[PDB]
Every structure is written in structure tokens, then in C-alpha cells.
């Protein structure tokens, strides 16, 4: 109850923070998916500008 | 599509205007030869008009 002596649990808590940093590290953010559509637009526009400079 | 026609647009443009430069200078020698045959009649018409 008023328990005692403490040599227990606290060494078994930091092994747990090797688990939770393994699972939650492999998550996906919805926002990152909206960023890859932006750089694809500017690249072909500059490639068309490279084709416009191939005209001009 | 728009950059495929951008190839073909400059190859019908260039061959038209590079023959306009052929014929814009071609008229420059006819009108200076036609006025060469005409002027040599004009200064011999002055002597055909003076002595009368």
C-alpha cells in the first residue's frame, strides 16, 4: 500500500519507451500528401519554360 | 500536346519569313533597273525637246 523501497517498476518503464517510439513512429500525416502535388506543378511548368526557351 | 505543336510552329514560321527576305530584296533590284532604263530615255528626251 504505502508501498516501499522502489527498486522495482522504474527500470521497467524505459524499456517501454523503446516500444512506443517504434509503433507511433510509423504513422502517416494527411498534410504531407498535399505537399507533393505542389512541386510536380512547378517542375513541368519550368520544363515547359525550358521548352518555351527552346522556342524563344 | 501544346509543346509538340510548339516544335512545328517555328518550322513553318521560319521558312516563310526567310523567303520574304529573298523577295523583299528581289524587288529592290527590279525597281532600280526599270528606273535605269527609263532615266536614260528621259535625259535624251530633253535634247529631243530643246533644239526644237
Cell digits of residue A21:
517510439
Query: What's the reported resolution, in angstroms, to a tenth?
Result: 3.5
Please tell me the experimental approach by which this structure was elucidated: cryo-EM
Look-up of cell digits 516500444: A19
Those residues with Cβ within 8 angstroms of residue B5's Cβ, 6 or more apart along the chain or in another chain: none
CA distance A20 to A25: 8
- CA dihedral defined by B24, B27, B31, B32, rounded to 10 degrees? 70
CB A56 within 8 A of CB B8: no
CA distance B9 to B11: 6
What is the DSSP track for A9-44? GGGGSTTHHHHHHHHTTS---SSHHHHHHHHHHHHH
CA distance B38 to B41: 5
**Distance in Å, alpha carbon of B39 to nearest chain A alpha carbon:** 47
Q: From B13, B15, B5, B11, select the one nearest A48 (Cα to Cα).
A: B5
The answer to whether residue B9 neighbours chain A at the CB level (below 8 Å) is yes
Amino acid at each position: 500500500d504505502t508501498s516501499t523501497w522502489f527498486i522495482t517498476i522504474t527500470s521497467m518503464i524505459m524499456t517501454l519507451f523503446i516500444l512506443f517510439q517504434l509503433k507511433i513512429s510509423n504513422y502517416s500525416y494527411p498534410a504531407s500528401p498535399e505537399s507533393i502535388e505542389l512541386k510536380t506543378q512547378k517542375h513541368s511548368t519550368p520544363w515547359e519554360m525550358k521548352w518555351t526557351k527552346i522556342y524563344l | 500536346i501544346d509543346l509538340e505543336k510548339s516544335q512545328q510552329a517555328l518550322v513553318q514560321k521560319r521558312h516563310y519569313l526567310f523567303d520574304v527576305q529573298r523577295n523583299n530584296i528581289a524587288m529592290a533590284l527590279e525597281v532600280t533597273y526599270r528606273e535605269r532604263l527609263h532615266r536614260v530615255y528621259k535625259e535624251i528626251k530633253n535634247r529631243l525637246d530643246y533644239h526644237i
